[PDB]
Amino acid sequence: INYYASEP
Amino acid sequence: EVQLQQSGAELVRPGTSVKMSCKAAGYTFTKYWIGWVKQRPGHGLEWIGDIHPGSFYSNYNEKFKGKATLTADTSSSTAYMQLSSLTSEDSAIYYCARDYYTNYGDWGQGTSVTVSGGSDIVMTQAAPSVSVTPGESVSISCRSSKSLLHRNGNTYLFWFLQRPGQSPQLLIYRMSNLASGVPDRFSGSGSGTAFTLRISRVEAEDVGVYYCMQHLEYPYTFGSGTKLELKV
Numbered sequence A: 001i002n003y004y005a006s007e008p
Numbered sequence B: 001e002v003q004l005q006q007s008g009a010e011l012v013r014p015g016t017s018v019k020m021s022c023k024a025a026g027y028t029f030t031k032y033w034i035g036w037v038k039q040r041p042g043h044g045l046e047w048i049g050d051i052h053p054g055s056f057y058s059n060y061n062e063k064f065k066g067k068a069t070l071t072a073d074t075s076s077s078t079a080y081m082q083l084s085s086l087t088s089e090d091s092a093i094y095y096c097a098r099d100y101y102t103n104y105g106d107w108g109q110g111t112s113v114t115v116s117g118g119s120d121i122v123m124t125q126a127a128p129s130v131s132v133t134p135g136e137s138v139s140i141s142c143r144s145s146k147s148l149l150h151r152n153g154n155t156y157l158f159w160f161l162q163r164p165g166q167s168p169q170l171l172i173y174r175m176s177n178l179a180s181g182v183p184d185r186f187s188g189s190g191s192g193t194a195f196t197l198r199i200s201r202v203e204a205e206d207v208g209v210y211y212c213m214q215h216l217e218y219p220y221t222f223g224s225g226t227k228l229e230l231k232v
Helices: none
Strands: B003-006 B010-012 B018-025 B034-039 B045-051 B058-060 B068-073 B078-083 B092-100 B103-107 B111-115 B129-132 B138-144 B157-162 B168-173 B186-190 B194-199 B208-214 B226-230
Touching: B003 B092, B003 B103, B010 B018, B018 B092, B018 B111, B034 B068, B045 B068, B045 B208, B058 B068, B078 B092, B103 B157, B103 B168, B129 B138, B138 B157, B138 B208, B138 B226, B157 B186, B157 B194, B168 B186, B194 B208
Parallel strands: B010 B111, B129 B226
Antiparallel strands: B003 B018, B018 B078, B034 B045, B034 B092, B045 B058, B068 B078, B092 B103, B092 B111, B138 B194, B157 B168, B157 B208, B186 B194, B208 B226
8 A cells, every 4th residue: 555646 | 333423403604614424433543544525415425535544634526625624633534524615505415435445335324514627537327317217127327438447457436326215225346246235136237437337126125316426536526326116
């Protein structure tokens, strides 16, 4: 899980 | 179980601000994004932005940059949204939803507020409604303005049902996958740019508005909805 975008 | 418990209805006047809350429980608050969605009559569902309570970083739909402010409090596991310069356009129900690996599978109950982009992916749903008799099967179509296929191999198309007086619920994720708790009478297929939700053996519990949504690229976008009702 990226902390700066929820985009896949 | 995951719970998202939103603050109460607001009756407010134009030109003011309002701040609403979304209390999370049943999972690690700082691990997942929380998105916010606006449900305004005649205007379907519209995505506002999201926030990561671990980093406090927020992403906004450009349409809401200068309207909405997302914050989070890790002490109380609460996400907040503040709206400024309220107008009639802001009268709506506002939902928070937890993003689980791109799935908006957990939704708050909504907060009602009553006020007394060229490159965005456009999602279309040609049918405003479908009228069916119980036990009939039905197909609902959606199209996206660009492919929703990602380099990882997944197609980031989602279907939701919003039953009358309820929050949206996730039915199908990543084009074809059945969400937990949803009957396997629901299925999804598509080409990456055109999609079909199929419902076999329709029953009264299936009544409501069906929305497609893309979670490929910010801003996330929803189709205009197709209302399912039982027949004339």
